[PDB]
Ligand binder design. Structure first.
Ligand SMILES: Nc1ncnc2c1ncn2[C@@H]1O[C@H](COP(=O)(O)OP(=O)(O)NP(=O)(O)O)[C@@H](O)[C@H]1O
Ligand SMILES: [Mn+2]
Ligand SMILES: [Mn+2]
Length: 209
């Protein structure tokens, strides 16, 4: 059980999320067909997440709000590609939501996923569905619903991942090129990789490098 997430647990979630995305960067690159099939979503997201991870690793804190400012700054100064910019905006909104907190419970975690979705949609001038935005939105809606009756952040994150994966598997039904080529959205897949790392960290586990 995880009732509260402090700054070091959040840092662990960042580090293991980044490692899991790094492990899967070639896989995510291989799916990248939209907007242009230039095969770089995984690399772009990996480089972005790595910039946030390095800032965090060099400036740890027990205070989740302070650690979030560090992570957010690292992403925003290292964003690469459409996918990396969107990832940085998703977590800018997440981190802004907890800026004054030292630790957060499952309800505030869910509210922070939702705040990130709102920030990222506002940052994209013409949002398209079937994308990283769709997956993030469906994950956040799942988070809000589950957290209402679920104190344990491990159980919450497991549910978020189940529902995020259902949304990811549905992305070809929203975006024609995905169904025509036969792939799920690369940006959403990269985000799922980060969320899977989040769960490993909540369990006190490490992603194999
Ligand atoms: N308008 C959009 N709305 C939502 N998500 C988007 C949009 N445009 C791109 N994406 C996401 O960004 C991913 C592609 O990211 P990425 O490969 O990093 O883009 P890019 O290579 O930088 N730009 P491009 O060369 O124009 O395709 C997609 O799989 C979607 O998840
Ligand atoms: Mn590109
Ligand atoms: Mn690309």
């Amino acid at each position: 059980m995880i009732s509260k997430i402090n700054g070091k647990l959040f840092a662990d979630m960042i580090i293991q999320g980044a490692q899991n995305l790094s492990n899967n960067a070639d896989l995510v690159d291989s799916l990248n067909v939209y907007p242009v099939p230039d095969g770089d979503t995984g690399t772009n997201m990996n480089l972005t997440m790595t910039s946030g991870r390095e800032e965090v690793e060099n400036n740890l804190s027990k205070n989740i709000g302070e650690l979030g400012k560090t992570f957010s700054k690292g992403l925003l100064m290292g964003a690469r590609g459409n996918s990396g910019v969107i990832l940085s905006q998703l977590f800018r909104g997440f981190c802004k939501n907890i800026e004054s907190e030292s630790e957060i419970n499952s309800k505030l975690l869910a509210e922070s996923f939702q705040a990130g979705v709102e920030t990222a949609y506002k940052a994209v001038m013409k949002p398209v569905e079937g994308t990283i935005l769709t997956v993030a939105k469906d994950a956040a809606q799942a988070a809000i619903e589950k957290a209402n009756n679920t104190e344990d952040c491990i159980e919450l994150m497991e549910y978020i991942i189940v529902k995020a994966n259902e949304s990811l598997e549905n992305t070809p039904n929203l975006l024609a090129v995905l169904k025509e080529v036969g792939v799920v959205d690369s940006g959403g897949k990269g985000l799922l990789c980060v969320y899977e790392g989040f769960l490993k960290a909540l369990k006190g586990e490490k992603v194999e490098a």
